[PDB]
């Protein structure tokens, strides 16, 4: 029963069209709870979940101040990185940052993350010990030396193993009805002939939370998708010789199920 | 809650 808190930051430069676009979102597990958009009117951290709204103005003042500081550094990043790779001002570019922490089913610290990307490629990343950096190419090395000397890793490590974890626990409690729920998948099966000698069996999993699920035929496999109401969907298909439909069983594994389900054409 | 330290320009 592990949980995570994860922040995503996107900055896209817009050549000759003013400020770069900046997008920040915050997740607890598969559930988004905050966002900031530099193009929006409010110019503040915005709630995206009912349970974060109980937080007072000091919280929002704090988050708006930090998220603005985040966008300032990334604004400068775009200029700097364009230089590191010797690129012209004529094109748009993207920088991305993601970080956060995982806790176990006991809500103790489990793991930590911090990664940076330029134009969708690994740029520099904090290793698993949270004490050193992984730098990809020649350009990232200069950032590595700078951040080593500035003791960035020590600072991020203190946040990830401390503040991140403490607050992740606070969120889990305040939104326990939302975040600590197991909606078991509602299942059903579909049959359609594809030829005179073979047919398609499709196994459906609907309205489940969280996203993690296993669908197994004993295969065409679409990726898990959001329903739009806070739940998820998935299906798996097999092509079966007609008449032999009964030989195949679909198997469903999910946290919300006391015991796994088995479905065959019926 | 966002990080208030360790976020720096590259």
């Amino acid at each position, epitope marked *: 029963g592990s949980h995570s808190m994860r922040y995503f930051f996107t900055s896209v430069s817009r050549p000759g069209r003013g400020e770069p676009r900046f997008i920040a979102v915050g997740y607890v597990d598969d559930t988004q709870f905050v966002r900031f958009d530099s193009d929006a009117a409010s110019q503040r951290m915005e709630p995206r979940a009912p349970w974060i709204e109980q937080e007072g103005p000091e919280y929002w003042d*704090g988050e708006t*101040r*930090k998220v603005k*500081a985040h966008s*300032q*550094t990334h604004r*400068v990043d775009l200029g700097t990185l364009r230089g590191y790779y010797n690129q012209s001002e004529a094109g748009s570019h993207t920088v991305q940052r993601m970080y956060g922490c995982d806790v176990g089913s006991d809500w103790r610290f489990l793991r930590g993350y911090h990664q940076y990307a330029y134009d969708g490629k690994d740029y520099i990343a904090l290793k698993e010990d949270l004490r050193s950096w992984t730098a990809a190419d020649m350009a990232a090395q200069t950032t590595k030396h*700078k*951040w080593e*000397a*500035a*003791h*960035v890793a*020590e*600072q991020l*490590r*203190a*946040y990830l*193993e*401390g*503040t991140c974890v403490e607050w992740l626990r606070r969120y889990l409690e305040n939104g326990k009805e939302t975040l600590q729920r197991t909606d078991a998948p509602k299942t059903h099966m579909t049959h359609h002939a594809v030829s005179d000698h073979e047919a398609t069996l499709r196994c459906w999993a609907l309205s489940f939370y969280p996203a993690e699920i296993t669908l197994t035929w004993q295969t065409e496999l679409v990726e898990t998708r959001p329903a739009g109401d806070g739940t998820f969907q998935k299906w798996a298909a097999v092509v079966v010789p007609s008449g032999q439909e009964q030989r195949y069983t679909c198997h469903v594994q999910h946290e919300g199920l006391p015991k796994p389900l088995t479905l065959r054409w019926e | 809650e966002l990080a*208030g*330290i360790g*976020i*720096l*320009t590259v």
Partner: T-cell receptor, first 109, second 115 residues
Framework: EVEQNSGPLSVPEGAIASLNCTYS??????FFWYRQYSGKSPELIMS????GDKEDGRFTAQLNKASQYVSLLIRDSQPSDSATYLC???????????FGAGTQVVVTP | AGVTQTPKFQVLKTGQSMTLQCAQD?????MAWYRQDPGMGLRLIHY???????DQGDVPDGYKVSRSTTEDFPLRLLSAAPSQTSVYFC??????????????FGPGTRLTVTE
């Protein structure tokens, strides 16, 4: 508000000097110890961010965010460590540094 | 070379005016002025996050600063009062976005205002 005992602390050479310091803002993220020889300027000797201990040379810093105190240990005390040690606390990188009045240490030969 | 102040000692009579020099050659964006009085520790007077930009500290009354260049950050005493008797420290560091954390202090200016 950053609080320190003025001292002076009298510590024998070779013994371990034990300084501590308390702060009122629970959201504080950055903790520092500055050293100031008499009639001289403060100079940063230690910084700490995580709960627990951090160790750098003869200096050890200890941080407890829950109890809101921060400590400095000086191993192998020398007369040349006789000074005033200032506790410094801020919130976030851009925050304003808050200074304690300092504890004076006298290390006797 | 670090941070220099000028002068290191100064006696003033009430009502007199004086400028305390502070210079730094490390290209630090951030500079600040502190005062130390016996038993209180350091109080921020003014600071500057960059050229042409300055703001008030904990105790700015009676003082004025300017920031025309990166290197210099002078502190002007308008009309010296006995309360202004103290030791004044200049300090600098890179801006926080660049990783500035440690404050680099100058040698200090001991200032006495006599009645």
């Amino acid at each position: 508000e950053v609080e320190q005992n003025s001292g002076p602390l009298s510590v024998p050479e070779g013994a371990i000097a034990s300084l501590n310091c308390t702060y009122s803002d629970r959201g504080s993220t950055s903790f520092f110890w500055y050293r100031q020889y008499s009639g001289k300027s403060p100079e940063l000797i230690m910084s700490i961010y995580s709960n627990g201990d951090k160790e750098d040379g003869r200096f050890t810093a200890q941080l407890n965010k829950a109890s809101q105190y921060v400590s400095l240990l000086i191993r192998d005390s020398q007369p040349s460590d006789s000074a005033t040690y200032l506790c410094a606390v801020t919130k976030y990188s851009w925050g304003k540094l808050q200074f304690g009045a300092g504890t004076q240490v006298v290390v006797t030969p | 070379a670090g941070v220099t102040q000028t002068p290191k000692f100064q006696v003033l009579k009430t009502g007199q005016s004086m400028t305390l020099q502070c210079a730094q050659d490390m290209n630090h964006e951030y500079m600040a002025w502190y005062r130390q009085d016996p038993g209180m520790g350091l109080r921020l007077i003014h600071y500057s996050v960059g050229v042409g930009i300055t703001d008030q500290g904990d105790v700015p009354d009676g003082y004025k600063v300017s920031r025309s260049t990166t290197e210099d950050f002078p502190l002007r005493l308008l009309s010296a009062a006995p309360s202004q008797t103290s030791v004044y420290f200049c300090a600098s560091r890179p801006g926080w976005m660049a990783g500035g954390v440690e404050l680099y202090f100058g040698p200090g200016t001991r200032l006495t205002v006599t009645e």
